[PDB]
Write an enzyme that holds these catalytic residues in place. Structure first.
Site, short mmCIF file in Angstrom:
data_model
loop_
_atom_site.label_atom_id
_atom_site.label_comp_id
_atom_site.label_asym_id
_atom_site.label_seq_id
_atom_site.Cartn_x
_atom_site.Cartn_y
_atom_site.Cartn_z
CG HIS D 200 -16.73 -6.97 1.51
ND1 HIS D 200 -16.35 -8.28 1.28
CD2 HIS D 200 -16.76 -6.38 0.29
CE1 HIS D 200 -16.16 -8.47 -0.01
NE2 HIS D 200 -16.41 -7.33 -0.64
CB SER D 204 -16.02 -0.03 -3.78
OG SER D 204 -15.50 -1.34 -3.87
CE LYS D 226 -15.34 -1.24 -14.27
NZ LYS D 226 -14.81 -1.73 -12.92
CG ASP D 227 -14.10 -7.81 -11.27
OD1 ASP D 227 -13.99 -6.59 -11.55
OD2 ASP D 227 -14.02 -8.21 -10.06
CD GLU D 270 13.72 -9.36 -12.01
OE1 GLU D 270 14.70 -9.76 -12.68
OE2 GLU D 270 12.59 -9.19 -12.52
C1 HEM Z 1 -2.08 -8.71 -2.11
C2 HEM Z 1 -2.37 -7.56 -3.07
C3 HEM Z 1 -3.75 -6.97 -2.90
C4 HEM Z 1 -4.90 -7.57 -3.16
C5 HEM Z 1 -5.11 -8.99 -3.62
C6 HEM Z 1 -5.88 -6.71 -2.92
C7 HEM Z 1 -7.28 -7.09 -3.15
C8 HEM Z 1 -8.20 -5.92 -3.26
C9 HEM Z 1 -9.55 -6.13 -3.79
C10 HEM Z 1 -10.12 -7.41 -4.33
C11 HEM Z 1 -10.22 -4.83 -3.73
C12 HEM Z 1 -11.63 -4.63 -4.22
C13 HEM Z 1 -11.95 -3.24 -4.77
C14 HEM Z 1 -10.93 -2.65 -5.71
O1 HEM Z 1 -10.08 -3.32 -6.24
O2 HEM Z 1 -10.92 -1.46 -5.90
C15 HEM Z 1 -9.23 -3.91 -3.12
C16 HEM Z 1 -9.51 -2.47 -2.87
C17 HEM Z 1 -8.55 -1.72 -2.01
N1 HEM Z 1 -7.25 -2.12 -1.64
FE1 HEM Z 1 -6.31 -3.79 -2.08
N2 HEM Z 1 -5.36 -5.45 -2.56
C18 HEM Z 1 -3.98 -5.72 -2.52
C19 HEM Z 1 -2.88 -4.78 -2.21
C20 HEM Z 1 -3.36 -3.47 -1.68
C21 HEM Z 1 -2.50 -2.49 -1.45
C22 HEM Z 1 -1.01 -2.62 -1.75
C23 HEM Z 1 -3.16 -1.46 -0.92
C24 HEM Z 1 -2.63 -0.09 -0.54
C25 HEM Z 1 -1.45 -0.15 0.42
C26 HEM Z 1 -4.45 -1.78 -0.86
C27 HEM Z 1 -5.45 -0.87 -0.23
C28 HEM Z 1 -6.79 -1.04 -0.88
C29 HEM Z 1 -7.76 -0.14 -0.75
C30 HEM Z 1 -7.60 1.13 0.08
C31 HEM Z 1 -8.84 -0.54 -1.43
C32 HEM Z 1 -10.17 0.22 -1.52
C33 HEM Z 1 -10.34 0.73 -2.95
C34 HEM Z 1 -11.53 1.62 -3.21
O3 HEM Z 1 -12.64 1.29 -2.82
O4 HEM Z 1 -11.40 2.62 -3.91
N3 HEM Z 1 -4.65 -3.12 -1.24
N4 HEM Z 1 -8.09 -4.62 -2.90
#
Ligand code: HEM
Ligand code: HEM
Ligand code: HEM
Ligand code: HEM
Lengths: 241, 49, 75, 378, 67, 60, 49, 54, 54
Positions: D200, D204, D226-227, D270
């Site tokens: 935040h 994004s 959209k979500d 798995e």
């Molecule tokens: C526990 C699993 C995860 C949850 C619940 C989670 C939750 C979220 C949420 C709600 C967003 C909001 C915007 C979007 O989806 O694009 C987001 C974006 C992002 N997440 Fe995760 N995420 C998780 C795992 C990851 C992983 C594995 C990575 C990479 C190692 C990651 C890196 C990012 C990044 C860099 C964004 C920014 C996306 C953008 O604005 O293009 N997160 N995530």
């Protein structure tokens, strides 16, 4: 030995997506379990009550359980008697200790049939084909006339005798009991022992597709309607000069 | 000179009930809202089930 | 941070918009829809497809060589 | 004035999913964040109900699980939604990490690293999860994997016995895993909140990789709906599996109660680990393999320092688009290999895909970037 | 004296082109291994191919009549 | 009759989030049932593998 | 394991200095016809077939 | 909430599960306790405002 | 372990076999009491001092 052959795909009446089990065919299959396997195969996870909503009736189920002697709890003397068998009783049968399977046969454990269809690879297909495809040894390898031959089996050589044509029988309204027709049944029963929920889920599945086939477009149109504003927005740039 | 600003033609996107400049949008507002609200009503009913 | 009103500076841009209750949710859905998707596919096939068929070929071959390596003729 | 804006609680909600400025731009690849969130509560919700019945002792481990599906009302959908939810969780996880790499979202150092921690965490969580029903694969998959740490010099032994609670995968080893598999998803969730906190700060990223401050839209009603739609799709996928092909992604071998002397010939983890399994055995070394397997996931943290292009997204860079999908395809090869026995073609092709994975990330993508800059006179 | 649909269907299936060739290769190997002594090229494979071609066709036709 | 349908539907039941809700809840009642009929009736028609088994084995 | 005359001769013929863990067969058994081992693989603890 | 007609097997595993998940929810709710508390700061022995001596 | 069969047993197993499972077990039990003492003290302070105006 270290080479194998995979089962064909038999057109089971529950191979289809929204396809229920043949219950008449689960009975015959049960009977097949009661006489044949039940003296070598454990089926610890199924009970007499489980059969009630499925094949038989309440009363029918009771009598079937009452045809064995169990071992109900201790009483006053710290004892252990024997009992007619209720409904709360499972199907724990053959041998007490595992090795008693072994001593009886020669090593060789006749694995429990409660979970077989789900635990091999190729469901009823593998079991049905192992049961039915019983055959004679080609050449160059002799068994030990203990380790019978089977092509639909890993190592093509292993342990169990073909009790599938040795015919018993008891189909109330009657049906011929060939090797094959008695095999579909034990297998059609073995599916249900491994997955009693089989039919219920497929009914929900039908609802799940029907529902989603209504909700999906509906939510789309909701999302389409709100994005309307952004999809048709027009821009104009009006700089000075 | 801001008077040269006319809103681009939207005919390409308008519902059929709102294609005529000759006529009120009041007449079809109910029906248009009716339509879109029925869509959400049904959805909720679905999600509810 | 964040918040509208403090994002950035922009001038001289007009934006005409329309109430959703005034327009259709699927204007020319298939009419303009399909042409677009073809276009997008075309725009990306040469970049997306090639690695996948490369895997596919290595998959089917690798499978055949496995199966056919486990049999013997003379010797 | 407005309550939604100033109430100490709602502020959060409001500034997190109501008024939050969002790009008008973000596409379907952006839905995975919310789906990961949904996967999380789903695993928590069904997972809980499963724990109200599952018992954690070898004696009843398998039994209780069976008890669940047969006796416990609807314990079967619950059980299957759980199992399949784990897979759905991994699909979205991999999709999410995919979007990030393609679009340069990783330029957000902290958000991304929290994501790597989210990855290892949900991964570590699921490894323990599957040991629970005490199936052949459970015990054995639990044995193969745990032991890996026995390569760490001077300490692997002591360590492996320490997390074992004995000299083998015993009783101690099952209750342990139950406990951790229960507490890990709570910590996951808190860490996911920090993921969002950090995210935040910037808002994004978007498909073009160009800043969108110039065209931001409120999260509600656009991305709430959209979500919503994209969650329904995740429900379709999930339900299609549990209601039609419940065992499709599962081994039949785990349906046979564990046996410490048995040892199946088949032996694989798995599906969601196959690529990493491949990478591991492709090395004829105890330390090597393990070190390489570690480097296989921990490399997600090297990515930002390997960024080389003058553009953030890959949308306008074709050499990189090609290299990207080669990377995807190469993981698909790794998945395939890991699911096959260590024999004939498979060995060497498995060793090729391995070197490739690393060449593609550690050298080919960085170089393509420099060339694409050069081609633009940048 | 029983009706064995399997055996009835096996006959007509066991006939067909694919199966002949595999049973041909089988007997070829059969005799090859029979006419040799101190050999270990043991004729297991050729049986399986015959079964595949046979049993695949066995499945498509079988159950159709089974009661 | 057609425009006035969606119209009347809006008039008498849709404005007030009250009625709008009163209807969806009431509309969920009738729907849940009518869907379970048709749906099960569909599950039966494609099957008939259990239930008519009862007419045979018992009736006492 | 009861080893036949053939297996005993084969382990005695093994080029020892080429081995990953150099050991002659006769310092791993007491009676050449018997080999006793823990069914635990030195890599990651699986059981050798 | 019994999982039967008495305090049975169902009743023990249930309680284990809840007794495991409740302290996590406790902790989150305690964070909101602090969030809300931080709006005003602490009260004090005199009940008089202390902004004048923080 | 959470099944009637081993419920009591596992607990005993903890205090006798499990290394230091006894301090752990007792810190747990007593911690629950300490938790209640502080809880009641906390609600006490609040009432006496009017902290509840929040
Ligand atoms: C526990 C699993 C995860 C949850 C619940 C989670 C939750 C979220 C949420 C709600 C967003 C909001 C915007 C979007 O989806 O694009 C987001 C974006 C992002 N997440 Fe995760 N995420 C998780 C795992 C990851 C992983 C594995 C990575 C990479 C190692 C990651 C890196 C990012 C990044 C860099 C964004 C920014 C996306 C953008 O604005 O293009 N997160 N995530
Ligand atoms: C219709 C009744 C029976 C059925 C359906 C049945 C089915 C099976 C199946 C599916 C297996 C495991 C196949 C596999 O491992 O892939 C098996 C193993 C075995 N059963 Fe049966 N069988 C039945 C009656 C018998 C009888 C009568 C005996 C006594 C001869 C027997 C003794 C064995 C043994 C020894 C094995 C172990 C095979 C081995 O691993 O070497 N079972 N059976
Ligand atoms: C804290 C909430 C969770 C609880 C209470 C929970 C508890 C359980 C229990 C008791 C089992 C054994 C019963 C069974 O297998 O059906 C299990 C299986 C499993 N759950 Fe969880 N778990 C939770 C969160 C997760 C998470 C975050 C994941 C990762 C997506 C996960 C993936 C698994 C896996 C892989 C299995 C074993 C495979 C199987 O279903 O057979 N669960 N869980
Ligand atoms: C989960 C148990 C609780 C925890 C962890 C908790 C945590 C805290 C903390 C850290 C403070 C900081 C200032 C201070 O202690 O005076 C506080 C103050 C306060 N708590 Fe709690 N509390 C808990 C239970 C309660 C209860 C049971 C009540 C009353 C129903 C309560 C109402 C208050 C109030 C009104 C204050 C303000 C005190 C003042 O400034 O004088 N909390 N609490």
């Amino acid at each position: 030995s270290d080479l194998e052959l995979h089962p064909p795909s038999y057109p089971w009446s529950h191979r289809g997506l929204l396809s229920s089990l043949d219950h008449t065919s689960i009975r015959r299959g049960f009977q097949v379990y009661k006489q044949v396997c039940s003296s070598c195969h454990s089926m610890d996870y199924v009970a007499y009550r489980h059969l009630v909503g499925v094949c038989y009736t309440e009363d029918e189920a009771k009598a079937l359980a009452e045809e064995v002697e169990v071992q109900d709890g201790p009483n006053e003397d710290g004892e252990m008697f024997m009992r007619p068998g209720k409904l709360s009783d499972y199907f724990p049968k053959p041998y007490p200790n595992p090795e008693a399977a072994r001593a009886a046969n020669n090593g060789a454990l006749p694995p429990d049939l409660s979970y077989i269809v789900r635990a091999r690879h190729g469901g009823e297909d593998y079991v049905f084909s192992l049961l039915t495809g019983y055959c004679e040894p080609p050449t160059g390898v002799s068994l030990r006339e203990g380790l019978y031959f089977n092509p639909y089996f890993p190592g093509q050589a292993i342990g169990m005798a073909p009790p599938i044509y040795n015919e018993v029988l008891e189909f109330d309204d009657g049906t011929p009991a060939t090797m094959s027709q008695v095999a579909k049944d034990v297998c059609t029963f073995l599916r249900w022992a491994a997955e009693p929920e089989h039919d219920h889920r497929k009914r929900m599945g039908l609802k799940m597709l029907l529902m989603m086939g209504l909700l999906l477009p509906l939510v789309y149109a909701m999302k389409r309607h709100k994005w309307s504003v952004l999809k048709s927005r027009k821009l104009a740039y009006r700089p000075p000069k | 000179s801001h008077t040269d600003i006319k809103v681009p033609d939207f005919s390409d996107y308008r519902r059929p009930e709102v294609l005529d400049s000759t006529k009120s949008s009041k007449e079809s507002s109910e029906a248009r809202k009716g339509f879109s609200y029925l869509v959400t009503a049904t959805t909720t009913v679905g999600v509810a089930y | 941070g964040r918040q509208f009103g403090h994002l950035t500076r922009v001038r001289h841009v007009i934006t005409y918009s329309l109430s959703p209750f005034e327009q259709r949710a699927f204007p020319h859905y298939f009419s303009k829809g399909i042409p677009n998707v073809l276009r997008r596919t075309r725009a990306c096939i040469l970049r997306v497809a090639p690695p996948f068929v490369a895997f596919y070929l290595v998959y089917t071959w690798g499978t055949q060589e496995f199966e056919k390596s486990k049999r013997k003729n003379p010797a | 004035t407005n309550i939604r804006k100033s109430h100490p609680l709602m502020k959060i909600v409001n500034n997190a999913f109501i008024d939050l400025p969002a790009p008008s731009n973000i596409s379907s690849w952006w839905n995975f964040g919310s789906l990961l969130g949904i996967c999380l509560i789903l695993q928590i919700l069904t997972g809980l109900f499963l724990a109200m019945h599952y018992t954690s002792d070898t004696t009843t481990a398998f039994s209780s699980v069976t008890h669940i599906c047969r006796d416990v009302n609807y314990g079967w959908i619950i059980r299957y939604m759980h199992a399949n939810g784990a897979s759905m969780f991994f699909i979205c996880l991999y999709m999410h990490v995919g979007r990030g790499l393609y679009y340069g979202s990783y330029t957000f150092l902290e958000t991304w690293n929290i994501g790597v921690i989210l990855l290892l965490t949900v991964m570590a969580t699921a490894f323990m999860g599957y040991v629970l029903p005490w199936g052949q694969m459970s015990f054995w998959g639990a044995t193969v994997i745990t032991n890996l740490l026995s390569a760490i010099p001077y300490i692997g032994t002591n360590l492996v016995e320490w997390i074992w609670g004995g000299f083998s995968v015993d009783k101690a080893t099952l209750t342990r895993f139950f406990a951790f598999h229960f507490i890990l998803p709570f910590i996951i969730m808190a860490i996911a909140m920090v993921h969002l906190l950090f995210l935040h700060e910037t808002g994004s990223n978007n498909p073009t990789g160009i800043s969108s401050d110039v065209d931001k839209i409120p999260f509600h009603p656009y991305y709430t709906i959209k979500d919503i739609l994209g969650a329904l799709l995740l429900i379709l996928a999930l339900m299609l599996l549990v209601l039609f092909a419940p065992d499709l992604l599962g081994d039949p071998d785990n349906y046979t109660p564990a046996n410490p002397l048995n040892t199946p010939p088949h032996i694989k983890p798995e599906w969601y680990f196959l690529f990493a399994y491949a990478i591991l055995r492709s090395i004829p070394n105890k330390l090597g393999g393990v070190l390489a397997l570690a480097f296989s996931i921990l490399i997600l943290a090297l990515i930002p320092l390997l960024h080389t292009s003058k553009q953030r997204s890959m949308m306008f860079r074709p050499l990189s688009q090609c290299l990207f999908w080669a990377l995807v395809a190469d993981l698909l090869t790794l998945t395939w290999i890991g699911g096959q026995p260590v024999e004939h073609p498979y060995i060497t092709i498995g060793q090729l895909a391995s070197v490739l994975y690393f060449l593609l990330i550690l050298v080919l993508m960085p170089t393509a970037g420099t060339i694409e800059n050069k081609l633009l006179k940048w | 004296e029983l009706v064995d649909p399997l055996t009835t269907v096996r006959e007509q299936c066991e006939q067909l082109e694919k199966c002949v060739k595999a049973r041909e290769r089988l007997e070829l190997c059969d005799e090859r291994v029979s006419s040799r002594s101190q050999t270990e090229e043991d004729c297991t494979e050729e049986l399986l191919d015959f079964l595949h071609a046979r049993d695949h066709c066995v499945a498509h036709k079988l159950f159709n009549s089974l009661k | 009759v057609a425009p006035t349908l969606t119209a009347r539907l809006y008039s008498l039941l849709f404005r007030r989030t009250s009625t709008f809700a009163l209807t969806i809840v009431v509309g969920a009642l009738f729907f849940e049932r009518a869907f379970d009929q048709g749906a099960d009736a569909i599950y039966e028609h494609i099957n008939e593998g259990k239930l008519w088994k009862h007419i045979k084995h018992k009736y006492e | 394991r009861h080893r036949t005359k053939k297996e005993i001769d084969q382990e005695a013929a093994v080029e020892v200095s080429q081995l990953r863990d150099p050991q002659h067969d006769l310092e791993r058994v007491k009676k050449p016809e018997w080999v006793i081992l823990i069914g635990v693989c030195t890599h990651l603890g699986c059981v050798p077939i």
